[PDB]
């Protein structure tokens, strides 16, 4: 709770407040975002689940987020990011994007996940890059690690992608407290790193719904590239040991595509449809090499031409 009607009436209020601010601004009139900020209920603990968190369950709530950020200051935006991180596991979008809680998502559920990802992660990237200081990024990570089961978040594409954004920004911000925060994150992941890879039945289900024969796992390798990057030799050792089977599953998949390419390219007669198939195979074969190499290169390793070796 809730309830459903109350949250929908709250979104309508947010829409009304934003439209008044937008109208005032356009006409070059003085804007006051107090009524709008109060309509959000960020500083509200009167319910089991925070009303703003509940607003994010609805696509209409998600779509107005960039417009809300146009009328907020630095601290207000940070309060929003902190409420999101603090209650990540109680966000229905995380429950929908997790292969554990939602093993069979509907196409509608997948569209909601994708809408949320391109809107909410764009907002977070824009705020953290320009501009947020060390203490604030460290604070968001600690909020995420202390108020959530981190391994459950890594089973969700949004959860994993939110963690990658935070690690990658922290890695850029220092040219020693991060070293302690990173190890707290590593602690919560150790012996569960393989669980970031969804089971085959989940991937087969996502593929049927989108009519595709290849799963995009670039985000999984980007998370791993980031984690290995900020880790010491002992962390990299654990990562390699835990994801070893996934590295060899990706290589087998790429080598299967490499052989399909060679067998079809030798065919004397070639139509535009065989041309399309070969380009599709070449594209997917090269994508697997690139995704795995984003991770391996970080540890000075490279997959070429048929094996893994030290990067020159």
């Amino acid at each position: 709770s809730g309830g459903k009607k109350f949250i929908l009436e709250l979104i309508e209020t947010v829409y009304e407040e934003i439209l008044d601010l937008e109208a005032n601004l356009r006409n070059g009139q003085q804007t006051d975002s107090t009524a709008m900020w109060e309509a959000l209920h960020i500083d509200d603990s009167s319910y089991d689940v925070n009303p703003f968190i509940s607003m994010l369950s609805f696509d209409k709530g998600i779509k107005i987020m960039p417009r809300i950020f146009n009328f907020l200051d630095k601290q207000q935006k940070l309060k929003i990011l902190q409420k999101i991180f603090n209650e990540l596991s109680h966000l229905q979008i995380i429950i929908l994007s997790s292969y554990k809680t939602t093993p069979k998502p509907t196409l509608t559920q997948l569209k909601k996940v994708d809408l949320f990802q391109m809107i909410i992660l764009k907002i977070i990237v824009s705020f953290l890059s320009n501009n947020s200081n060390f203490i604030e990024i460290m604070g968001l990570l600690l909020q995420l690690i202390r108020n959530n089961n981190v391994s459950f978040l890594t089973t969700s594409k949004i959860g994993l992608n939110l963690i990658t954004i935070l690690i990658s920004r922290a890695a850029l911000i220092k040219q020693s407290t991060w070293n302690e925060i990173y190890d707290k994150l590593f602690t919560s992941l150790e012996s569960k790193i393989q669980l970031i890879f969804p089971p085959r039945e989940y991937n087969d289900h996502i593929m049927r719904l989108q009519n595709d024969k290849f799963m995009d796992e670039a985000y999984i390798w980007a998370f791993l590239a980031s984690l290995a990057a900020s880790g010491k030799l002992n962390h990299q050792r654990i990562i390699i040991d835990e994801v070893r089977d996934e590295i060899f599953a990706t290589i087998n998949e790429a080598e299967t595509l490499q052989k399909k390419e060679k067998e079809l390219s030798v065919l004397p007669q070639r139509s535009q449809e065989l041309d399309t198939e070969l380009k599709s195979i070449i594209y997917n074969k090269e994508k697997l090499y690139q995704d795995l190499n984003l991770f391996l290169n970080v540890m000075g390793l490279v997959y070429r031409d048929g094996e893994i070796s030290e990067l020159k």
Binding site: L233, Q236, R237, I240, D241, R244, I247, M299, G300, L301, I308, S309, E310, L311
Partner: peptide, 17 residues
């Protein structure tokens, strides 16, 4: 070194299990 670390990681990765 970065070389010795990379070699340790390669050797670990190349183990069957």
């Amino acid at each position: 070194t970065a070389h010795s670390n990379s070699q340790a990681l390669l050797d670990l990765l190349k183990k069957p299990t």
